[PDB]
Write a protein that binds this ligand. Sequence first.
Ligand SMILES: [Cl-]
Ligand SMILES: [Cl-]
Lengths: 377, 377
Amino acid sequence: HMLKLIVETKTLVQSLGFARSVVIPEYANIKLSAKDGNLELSSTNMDLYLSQKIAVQVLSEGEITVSTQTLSDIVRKLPDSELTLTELDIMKLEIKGQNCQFNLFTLPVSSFPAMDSIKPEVSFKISCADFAKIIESTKFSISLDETRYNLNGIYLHIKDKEFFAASTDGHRLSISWITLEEKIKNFGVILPQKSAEEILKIVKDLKNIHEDIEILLSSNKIKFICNENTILLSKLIDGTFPDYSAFIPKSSISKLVINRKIFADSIERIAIITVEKFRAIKLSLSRKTLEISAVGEARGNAKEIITASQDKESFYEYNCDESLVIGFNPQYLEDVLKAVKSNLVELYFSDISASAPVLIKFPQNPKDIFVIMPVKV
Amino acid sequence: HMLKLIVETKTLVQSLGFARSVVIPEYANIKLSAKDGNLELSSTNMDLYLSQKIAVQVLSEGEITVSTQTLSDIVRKLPDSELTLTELDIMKLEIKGQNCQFNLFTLPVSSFPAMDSIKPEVSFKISCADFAKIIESTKFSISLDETRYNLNGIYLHIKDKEFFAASTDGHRLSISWITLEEKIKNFGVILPQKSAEEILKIVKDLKNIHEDIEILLSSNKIKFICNENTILLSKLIDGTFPDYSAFIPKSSISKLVINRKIFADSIERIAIITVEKFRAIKLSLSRKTLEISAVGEARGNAKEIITASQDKESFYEYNCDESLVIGFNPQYLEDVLKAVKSNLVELYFSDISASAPVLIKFPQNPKDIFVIMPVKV
Ligand SMILES: [Cl-]
Ligand SMILES: [Cl-]
């Protein structure tokens, strides 16, 4: 029972790309299992276990483990449209193209870890495109200092018939959600950042983006089954996620509506002049104009004017007689503006003060909510 | 007398790119001098002095110095096709687009160094495209350990009516030359690697690549005048360059001729399996086939076969009844194969031994010569 199979090179390349992004000496290896018409590729690290199955021509069933880096480095440089992989009885894997041959040392399959299991408290199916959106809307506002453990992940939780992703670092809040088909018990987990990054890449793949992903949750792990053939098992962050609806404002006295792109682009160039000790831009809002300005000590200052317009390509509107001057960290604003593809963006102000948290919404994207603490300017 | 000018943004962006690649606190600044229809931009470090002149609308003549990083970071994010630059009397430079304004702190022009001078022993003019070729054929085989000082540059020297570039690291030798229009005294200098990198970028620019570069040499510096308006003054490496014709072989018993691309691509994938402690590939040459193989300890082995062919796209020929087995560092081979755009490449073997230096030539490129020491395999 020795592995032998013919695989489409481009397909193997793509699978190895996911294996590389996942990665103890055993973590440097990938397990290849040829069985029942498929090649199963297994990769694991301290927090993730990834299993991918791809259709191949299974000529002989078997399993080997080999260096992930070595195998992917070779395969992505082979010009052949198909490759033959053969386990030989010298603890070696032969990779054969039309004119070239590579013999890789293999490692004992018995030293490769098998995947653990889950006893889910809840499980449900959502579309890959919906899951990609909620992760893309929350991955950027995860906290990054390792002291606040319960903030270094994305809170995934079911409330009523809705599935939320939420992230915060104490300075901003990001929430994105999906309506579930059936009712389902309320439950929540904190997904580690690396795990979120990996599953996002998997669902965004062109083979998966139009299909569905099953999600299984328990108190100690989460399991993703993406379009049947890709399984990712992840540890969780062991913490309580704060009840974040405490930091969402319930009212507003005024709102800015502005073309998203011109806003993002203006913030970016005005923030160039700032320094790290004072990363802030100032918005001076009026009915007629928006002024975006910043200062940087021993560097200079900058200002851009955006005038009122009802044209979609240059839209700016602020329907309030009272002008408002308010500051923000430009990176936090840019993070939100880049998370959602939308023509317009809306900023809601709780009061006529430069201290209240600001709520950000994109029209034609009602299921995303962002809150940013302002800074004194 | 305060600077004020209108400049095409894209032109300023390109000039600042060269200024950035050049870069003591004074080295962080760029001098802008508006005079007689041009903006002159000066940048300097410990070894280079760069002066660029670009046509602008000089509205008022003057000079300022400002942070290179800050100015380029701002200008490359401005969408305006033209910008106005105005020195104001608060030691500040205003950069104005249509809707935005940046005020940069300036530094005293009197603290910016002026360029030194040259009293050339020889001077001559060659085309930018010819100079680019000889630098591209020699920059990769400069030595990189700082002990052998006289090898960490490109030897530029006039012999008879020919102008040579030559570089070596003790393992390989690269020589490329140009025929000069007039006779000129024999003279040579060692151009530092960074200086070679910078002038190569300048001559390769689309505005300069079809024009000429004047070269002025003295015992202690070299001056380039590229297409009239860009001047680069460089220090030299103070050493004697070895008479390298000692390491060129004068005869050959056999030669391989092979399609350059298939050779480079095969070497690259076969070398994947090697390790750093033994970076070598093996060529087994025969009339009928070329076998390219390698081994990597605790990794595996690899082999590719190239068969005899007279077709240009897959050319392989070796007109010798005696087979030859010879090894090389694959990076040294790849360096040469990537330096010259040519369909075929030729390897000349001094004798039927795996120890003699190998001479490499590209047909339709007679003015390039490369020699590589083989390695035992
Ligand atoms: Cl079988
Ligand atoms: Cl004037």
